[PDB]
């Protein structure tokens, strides 16, 4: 998430995002993953406590 | 609060920083098992580094 | 597994307020796998029309947590639906028995996975009630070996603003 903005071009005269430069959605058939260290998210199973 | 220090140290298990490091220079990975002219590449890396 | 009858004329306004979990029985493995150190659990039951907001107050490593949940009214008095927030499934909760100032025996099932819990208003509980619960567990067909009594003291109330799941 948020990887798309790294794709977008930049206009230094206005400090505004442009159109995409990089393809933010392209994987080249590779399956490089990234460990999201904040993955922890509390859940409560009422049936189990 | 001691509570928030407990919560922080709990969450460091899952997303720790690297406090101490012992490192070897990357040329030590350059090994004939993988690369032709391994010695030459190795030496080039030493010089370049 | 059946929709047993709820408490005859269940009343959320009488059942409202504090309830103390006495014991649970279920197959749910985590009750046994890391089943140790199960924290004391207490409910505040708040009428919300026919539904109730229920806050389970619990410790987690001494961090006091409150879980806000709606026992959504099915329209059958004393049968409730807990909506799934893309949780593993909604929980059908039948309040099968209670004395509103004394005890409640809540039946809960999700996806056909059933659990039964004894709640009380008081630290001391008549062994009569507990034995009755045991009976309904046998009738639940759950082994006694699946009964997990919860520690008598160390209840927590009023979890921090930051220690609330707000699950609703």
Residues 6 or more apart in contact with residue C101 via CB below 8 angstroms = C14, C121
Token pair 């309904």 is found at C136
Which residues of chain A are within 8 Å of residue B15 when distances are taken between CB atoms?
Answer: 37-38
Tokens 């959605």 belong to A25
Yes or no, beta carbons of C56 and A44 under 8 Å apart = yes
Residue C127 phi, psi dihedral angles, 5° rounding: -55, -30
Neighbours of C16 (CB within 10 A): 16
Specify whether the CB–CB gap between C115 and C24 falls below 8 A: yes
B2 Cβ neighbours under 8 A, 6+ residues apart = none
Q: d(Cα B26, Cα B14) in Å, to the nearest integer? A: 27
Q: Which two tokens stand for residue C160?
A: 């921090």
Distances (CA, A) of B23 to A25, B16, B20, B26, C30: 35, 18, 10, 9, 42
Three-class SS state of C26: coil
Nearest to C91 among A42, A46, A49 (CB): A46
Residue in A39, A4, A46 with CA at minimum distance from that of residue A22: A4
Dihedral of alpha carbons C78, C8, C12, C123, sign: negative
Q: Which residues from C are below 8 Å from A44, CB to CB? A: 56, 67, 69, 165, 167
Q: Return phi, psi of residue C132, to 5°.
A: -50, -50
Q: What is the resolution of this structure in A?
A: 3.3
Determine contact: C60 vs chain B, CB below 8 A. no
Across the interface, whether the CB atoms of B3 and C61 are under 8 A apart is answered: no
CB A2 within 8 A of CB A8: no
Structure determination technique employed: cryo-EM
> Are the C-beta atoms of A10 and A20 separated by less than 8 Å?
no
> Running DSSP on this structure, what letter comes out for residue C151?
P
Query: Are C26 and A47 inside 8 Å of each other by CB?
Result: yes
């Amino acid at each position: 998430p948020g990887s798309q903005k790294a794709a977008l071009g930049y206009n230094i005269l206005t400090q505004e995002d442009a159109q995409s430069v990089y393809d933010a959605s392209y994987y080249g058939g590779q399956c490089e993953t990234v460990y999201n260290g904040e993955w922890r998210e509390l859940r409560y199973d009422s049936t189990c406590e | 609060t001691a509570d928030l220090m407990q919560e922080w140290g709990d969450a460091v298990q899952y997303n720790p920083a690297i406090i101490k490091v012992k490192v070897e220079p990357l040329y030590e990975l350059v090994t004939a098992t993988d690369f032709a002219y391994s010695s030459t590449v190795r030496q080039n890396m030493k010089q370049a580094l | 597994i059946s929709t047993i009858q709820p408490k005859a004329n269940f009343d959320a306004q009488q059942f409202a307020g504090t309830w103390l979990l006495v014991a649970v029985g279920s197959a749910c493995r985590f009750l046994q796998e890391q089943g140790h150190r199960a924290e004391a659990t207490t409910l505040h039951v708040a009428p919300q029309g026919t539904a109730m907001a229920v806050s389970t107050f619990r410790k987690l490593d001494g961090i006091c947590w409150q879980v806000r949940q709606l026992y959504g009214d099915t329209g059958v008095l004393g049968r409730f639906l807990l909506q799934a927030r893309d949780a593993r499934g909604a929980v059908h909760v039948v309040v099968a028995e209670t004395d509103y100032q004394s005890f409640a025996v809540l039946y809960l099932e999700r996806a056909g996975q059933l659990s039964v819990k004894l709640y009380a208003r008081s630290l001391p509980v008549s062994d009569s009630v507990l034995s009755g619960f045991e009976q309904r567990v046998q009738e639940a067909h759950l082994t006694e070996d699946q009964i997990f009594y919860f520690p008598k003291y160390g209840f927590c109330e009023a979890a921090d603003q930051f220690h609330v799941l707000d699950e609703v």
